């Protein structure tokens, strides 16, 4: 089940059985690889890179053509971010809640949501600072 | 998450009680395969197919009329060859028939083979 609440949803998307090569498409390998690195330098998250490749350029799951994963390609090109993108999105939501509570101090429901959010940050931090993906003395922006 | 060897047992026990002849079992591990293959050698189950679904794994099996009950033991206790008959007398209905399965350096073996090979091991499960 869900980690912070009583949810038991089941909405996911199916991974294919085999992957082949997308011969119906209208670009070369080298063009697709160029499209990714452009979208990266403009500052898009890698989950959004995937959405665009599927929706506009017509490639499912973005790996059948490249034999390599999106984040690994960005490390080969040297475009790696300073913080992993998951930990980064958790710090953003915390900041937002603290900026709301700063002006609407009375909101007990928002107070409740903040302590849940903050717990999740530290649990994710401890993962990354074991795999050597963050400096040992990293601390939140707060 | 449930233990995979426990899940296997409850799935076949309930279906047998409901008088079904075949079932699909949904999460499979290496020792689950070896357990089922043991029940086939002693003629408790008849036909086995394994589905390679890339999501864990699953099996389809045909039950015989000879199977009354099976079960897993948790945890998997360590036993000397001196100890196994104690567990045999606790689990099985009669001195004449049924099988207690033990894991060893020589694979899965039954309580008779333990005497032949001169080896203890870890207790895994039983059927009769």
């Amino acid at each position: 089940a869900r980690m912070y609440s009583n949810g038991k949803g089941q909405s996911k998307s199916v991974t294919p059985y085999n992957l082949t090569y997308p011969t119906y498409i209208k670009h070369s390998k080298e063009e697709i690889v160029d499209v990714i690195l452009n979208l990266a330098r403009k500052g898009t998250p890698p989950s959004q890179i995937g959405n665009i490749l599927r929706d506009n350029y017509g490639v499912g799951k973005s790996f059948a053509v490249t034999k390599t994963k999106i984040l690994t390609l960005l490390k080969i090109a040297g475009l790696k971010p300073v913080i992993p993108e998951d930990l980064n999105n958790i710090v953003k939501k915390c900041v937002n809640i603290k900026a709301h509570l700063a002006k609407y101090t009375n909101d007990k429901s928002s107070k409740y949501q903040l302590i849940q959010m903050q717990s999740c940050l530290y649990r994710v931090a401890r993962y990354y600072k074991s795999k050597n993906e963050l400096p040992a003395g990293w601390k939140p922006p707060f | 998450m449930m233990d995979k060897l426990a899940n296997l047992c409850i799935t076949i026990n309930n279906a047998n009680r409901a008088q079904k002849r075949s079932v699909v079992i949904r999460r499979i591990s290496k020792v689950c395969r070896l357990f089922l293959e043991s029940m086939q050698k002693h003629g408790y189950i008849t036909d086995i197919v394994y589905i390679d679904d890339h999501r864990e794994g699953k099996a389809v099996v045909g039950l015989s009329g000879r199977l009354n009950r099976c079960g897993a033991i948790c945890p998997r206790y360590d036993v000397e060859l001196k100890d196994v008959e104690r567990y045999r007398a606790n689990l099985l209905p009669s001195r004449g028939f049924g099988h207690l399965i033990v894991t060893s350096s020589k694979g899965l073996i039954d309580h008779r083979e333990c005497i032949q090979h001169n080896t203890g091991g870890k207790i895994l499960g039983y059927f009769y």
Binding site: - | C74, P75, R76, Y77
Partner: protein, 140 residues
Amino acid sequence: MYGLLAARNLKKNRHKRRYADKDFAKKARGDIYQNAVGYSAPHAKGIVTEKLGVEAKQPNSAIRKCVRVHIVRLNKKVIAYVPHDGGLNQIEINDEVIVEGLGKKGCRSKGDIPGVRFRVCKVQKVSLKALVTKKKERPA
């Protein structure tokens, strides 16, 4: 607590559970040496100081014959029962008596006698059964 490497947790839990048993608790945590007859001694010597009688509990209707004893080993004074038909007549003030338990698990009242916990066994070194049935005589 049923894991294979859980022995320490399991042991500490199960030990703590036993204090719910009255028997284990009293031996561990009560005053087991407060009594004239009990854990300490099977019999007790003492001197008779007063003669006494008590009513039986309902629904019975009787006067039971009892004796006030000063116990040599503790300097407590206790009530004891005198068993036999004419038994009270075999005892004088300032006699020495030996005293015995009623046979329950803890020191508890037996039958219809309220609050009395011991009985007389011998008077002046001789069996009370022999005195009452006139098989033997007082030392004099």
